[PDB]
Amino acid sequence: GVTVENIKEGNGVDKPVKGDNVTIHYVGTLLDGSKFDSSRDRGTPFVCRIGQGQVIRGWDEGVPQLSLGEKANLICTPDYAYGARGFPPVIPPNSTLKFEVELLKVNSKRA
């Protein structure tokens, strides 16, 4: 449902698991490349508890495929993003999202 494309290598040792607190910078683009949101817009990385339903299914299954420090391309089908409803003002229905993420921190271990 979600594909992980590697940009930059990680350490290949510290990978998130269910329950870990990750800190991720990202930039979200539609299939046409037009951006819809980015943590770098706000100059502050995004934090969440991965693998507990707190974020979309594309993240809850793709972040475990990362390692600390790795840059990646989370490409989520609508069934793993916002679906046939989409986000009312931002994400159109049936949209395939691309999150270019960078795993800056897992729990408290900095990269």
């Binding site: 930039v27 037009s34 951006k35 819809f36 949101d37 980015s38 770098r40 817009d41 706000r42 100059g43 986000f87 009312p88 003002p89 931002v90």
Partner: protein, 372 residues
């Protein structure tokens, strides 16, 4: 009556973060808007701060700025003949607060001659401010400030991106349709100091002589193909100067329309039209500008790219640039971004942004109660 105080304490009865300025709540009056020196033009000094504080105009005020600027642009021909010295600027893309540092780096419009290559809207969430400001500037300095048309000064891309949403949000669709009809009056090219062709995009297989730019009917929307499209959309080939093809033009599979032009294509145009270089924008440069290969006849770079949007899209972390050109010396100055107020994606108000998460989590608990 309930009064809540949260623990150094703070109550709900006042603004929590005070160091951040509040927006301009009140539309300007007739004394604020109209200049005291000329009663037919806005006050640049007031507008600059009013827009800086995220202020807004009356619908009548915005329309007057777009229609009085449009009358000036319409009288100007398609191909401008501007004179040195001059400051040539690249894309600004709705980044109003960087446009403020641009004018400090390039010069005060009263003492300086400007040439923008278009792309004043979209991407940035302050696009109507850049337009209403520069259009007001055109009213004060119509002989010294010249504005050109980019591929975004149309109905096609503004509807596809963020500018049509912004006008609908900060003003009305009447302003938007007024903004689009005003864009159709923008000149398409410029010949600076009888040496450099100044456009937004690039060349075209239908662009042979400058007389072909003079024959364009610029009072329409950019077409799907042809001269008027490629002028605003064409890019230099990736391996420009180092090309592995003897072709003069190739299809632009990156933009989805128009063409790539090659070094041999640029040189032929400069040699036939007795020009020194091509000054354009379009492509964001990490260093704010980019010099392309030098011509075999004059040694001057065949193409120059100028980008004036620093920290493009708030993610690129690139530099901007302006072309301070005199005949003796060519100085390219670079500047860095400036903090701007925050907007939620697509001008979302707070409640549209937060209710889905509230509607989900409140529902999560109610379901958990019904299954004890």
């Amino acid at each position: 009556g309930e009064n809540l105080y949260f623990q150094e304490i703070v109550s709900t009865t006042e603004r929590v973060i005070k160091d951040v300025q509040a927006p301009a709540m009140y539309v300007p009056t007739d004394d604020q808007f109209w200049s005291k020196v000329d009663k037919t033009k806005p006050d640049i000094a007031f507008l600059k701060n009013h827009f800086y504080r995220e202020g807004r105009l009356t619908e009548e005020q915005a329309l007057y700025i777009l229609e009085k600027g449009g009358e000036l642009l319409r009288s100007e021909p398609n191909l401008l003949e501007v004179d040195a010295p001059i400051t040539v600027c690249g894309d600004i893309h709705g980044q109003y607060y960087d446009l403020m540092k641009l004018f400090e780096v390039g010069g005060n419009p009263a003492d300086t001659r400007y040439l923008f290559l278009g792309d004043y809207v979209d991407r940035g969430y302050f696009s109507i401010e850049c337009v209403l400001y520069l259009w007001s500037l055109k009213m004060w300095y119509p002989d010294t400030l010249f504005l050109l048309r980019g591929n975004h000064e149309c109905r096609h891309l503004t509807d596809y991106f963020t500018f049509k949403l912004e006008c609908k949000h900060k003003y009305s669709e009447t302003v938007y349709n007024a903004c689009m009809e005003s864009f159709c009056n923008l000149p398409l090219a410029a010949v600076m100091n009888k040496q450099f062709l100044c456009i937004h995009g690039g060349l075209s297989p239908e662009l042979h002589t400058l007389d072909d730019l003079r024959s364009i009917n610029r009072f329409r929307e950019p077409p799907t193909q042809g001269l008027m499209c490629d002028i605003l959309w064409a890019d230099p080939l990736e391996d420009f100067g180092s090309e592995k093809t003897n072709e003069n033009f190739l299809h632009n599979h990156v933009r989805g329309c128009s063409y790539f032009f090659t070094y041999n294509a640029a040189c032929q145009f400069l040699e036939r039209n007795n020009l020194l270089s091509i000054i354009r924008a379009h492509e964001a440069q990490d260093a704010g500008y980019r010099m392309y290969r030098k011509t075999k006849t004059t040694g001057f770079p065949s193409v120059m790219t100028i980008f004036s949007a620093p920290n493009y899209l708030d993610v690129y972390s690139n530099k901007a640039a302006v072309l301070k050109y005199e005949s003796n010396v060519m100085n390219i100055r670079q500047f860095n971004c400036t903090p701007h107020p925050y907007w939620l994606p697509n001008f979302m108000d707070v409640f549209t942004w937060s209710l889905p998460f509230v509607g989900e989590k409140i529902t999560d608990m109610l379901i958990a109660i019904l299954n004890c």
